[PDB]
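Q: Predict the bound structure with zinc ion.
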Amino acid sequence: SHMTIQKVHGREVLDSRGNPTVEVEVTTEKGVFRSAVPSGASVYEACELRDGDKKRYVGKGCLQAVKNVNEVIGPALIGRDELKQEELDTLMLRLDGTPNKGKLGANAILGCSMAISKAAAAAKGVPLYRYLASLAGTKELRLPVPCFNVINGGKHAGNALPFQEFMIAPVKATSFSEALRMGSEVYHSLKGIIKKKYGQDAVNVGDEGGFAPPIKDINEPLPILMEAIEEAGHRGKFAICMDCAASETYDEKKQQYNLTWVTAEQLRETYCKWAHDYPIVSIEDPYDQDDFAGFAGITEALKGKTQIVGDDLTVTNTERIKMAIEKKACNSLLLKINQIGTISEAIASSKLCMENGWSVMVSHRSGETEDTYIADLVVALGSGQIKTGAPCRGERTAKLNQLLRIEEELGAHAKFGFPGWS
Amino acid sequence: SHMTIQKVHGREVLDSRGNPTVEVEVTTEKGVFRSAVPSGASVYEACELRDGDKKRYVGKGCLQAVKNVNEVIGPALIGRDELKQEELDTLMLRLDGTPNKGKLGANAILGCSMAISKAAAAAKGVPLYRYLASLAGTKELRLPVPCFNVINGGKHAGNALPFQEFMIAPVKATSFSEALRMGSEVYHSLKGIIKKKYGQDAVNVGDEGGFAPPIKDINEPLPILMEAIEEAGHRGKFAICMDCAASETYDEKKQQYNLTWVTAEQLRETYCKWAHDYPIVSIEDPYDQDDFAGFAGITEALKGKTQIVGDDLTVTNTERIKMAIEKKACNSLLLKINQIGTISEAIASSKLCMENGWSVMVSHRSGETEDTYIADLVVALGSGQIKTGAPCRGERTAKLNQLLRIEEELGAHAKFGFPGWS
Ligand SMILES: [Zn+2]
Ligand SMILES: [Zn+2]
Ligand SMILES: [Zn+2]
Ligand SMILES: [Zn+2]
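A: Predicted complex:
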């Protein structure tokens, strides 16, 4: 019939770091719907298909993934009812036939899954976040507390700092508008504080908009963030979220954490000390991707005070998530749609986790685009936690602006934040 | 009647640096059309209205500008035919009544002018760039050579480098696709070259996605860019564009250029030496905003080999442009829509310049957004020269991706590049 999918086309585009990624457009009677796939540039993840042709983009081309969209998936979608998300996502999973989307590519299937949901939402006559909420059966929509990336370390910075991300979050804000503003003002106080204590050539930013100051000391980042919060004029209104990415400094051969050498229990120490002294309400990957025992041991320890977020642990993987749920290895799931492959599965994983008392933090990827899907997504799941970078760089601010638009659209009574952090 | 403007709404959003700016939406029977205003964070420019309220965004709020959209311009636009660009833009100029748009604000009028053109294009049934080309009477559309920002100096970097921007341009590319790819690959070779000669904590990027290495030497940037071009594998396919922003180091009290102290004729020297030895096909603001005599003296000197681009000289100002045209102070106009205020005037200035043999380089602003208007604009004017930053950072890549979409849409026969640089 009529209101059916008419065209499906994919193409190569650049992400925020100059690397190619996939973009898909689904055309229907109501228009053209386009979605772009994020990239993290980093085993449990769904397969991201790259050309590997050193002649183009240093082998990072996505021509094969685009081709799979234009030649295999697209033609199977022509004529189909875009309203059937689960049915269409299932078709693509079956079209691929492998557990990790290795034949067609997760970066080929995801663009389609996303664009389909956008076309279906338009067909229904409601914004994306509303269509996705009904899809996820979400009872209450809500604007998330944005966790802004402001200080980099580890593999991220040519620093003396081992841990990865240091974030600030306006938990006490009463609206996303105020939240975004506060985050912004603090980000600027920080820029000025870092320029004074490290120099002008120290405020340039990393992939996520945050700073990578030459921090040569480990108990320096937290206090500097408190000072920036203080100076911005928002003392007591923020909390802190960390992403240790502890795997990047762990080798079993030693069962060591070279920060110098420290171990787990001798690590669960630094954490507790930082979670007792600072308002750190969330720690991501405090341990290695497989140190389950250590994972669950820091989860019940900091329970009620600091959520433990799984990333290199859950890798947004179904099997991996259930292993974590069973061993209580963590209580917060970082949701990266491109690590799983489809929206039906992404939503399924969020629901499974929330059903087990877990919280969900929707996040971006190191390599983002002007795409704003996760903005509508985080609101549709009503999780109240998202991480799309510092309030700097277009691929980050595009999401923050979309959240502003969603709030305005919902009205003064729109709910804001994570109830456990307010 | 029917296909008329139904709603006009403005709001505050964040640009790529965390600072507020204006965004406008024009709703018609065919949909919602939104455009965001760029910001350069820097006398001849049209007025950018800021709140000046230190309580919000350090006085950078744009509530007054948004309010002017929602309360003065918007209501005057309800019911109007969006097809009449010049008529509607003229109305807004008259609504403001001041030569510099100081009553309503250039950042209030521009969003409206832009969104109106988008709504009119949809009403006509053609993409934005096509509607704008007919509006500008452009005879031949063409994809521009992108001039990528890769090395920062002056007020831009805590460098020992005085001059502002150093850009690379794939002039010999045969298509925008190839152009974007080459630019990207070189950008990556550069990242690796700079990391080796300056360190890991030296590849973080500036506002425009480029690098601000600790270059402590002045004849270092050019050779490093040639090396990066060479290594990427595109020897002889690139050219170089510079933005001296010579005003930032000039004080008449002295009539000096503190690079140390050098003068004009003793500056026109370094330029010539760099334009004789390197493939520098374009120099922006080689002199102070008022050193006309020096401006025209370097224009006929490097004529045929290196275009002289006016920025702090022309400030996209009508009166300023005519003074330059008369004295042959330069031959290339940097086009910044938010420096003038409306699309009719922006297009008028481009046509006036091209009619006098000048070239036109459409550009972004230090503070951009996920907006992609200038992508369709540069193509609509058929100038073949645009500058939207390095192939890094979403507010820059969003434009580069839009250009990719425009090319694909035009077809294999689509023209690419600036004929004088090919
Ligand atoms: Zn990170
Ligand atoms: Zn992580
Ligand atoms: Zn610049
Ligand atoms: Zn300039």
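A: The first helix of chain B runs from residue 63 to 77.
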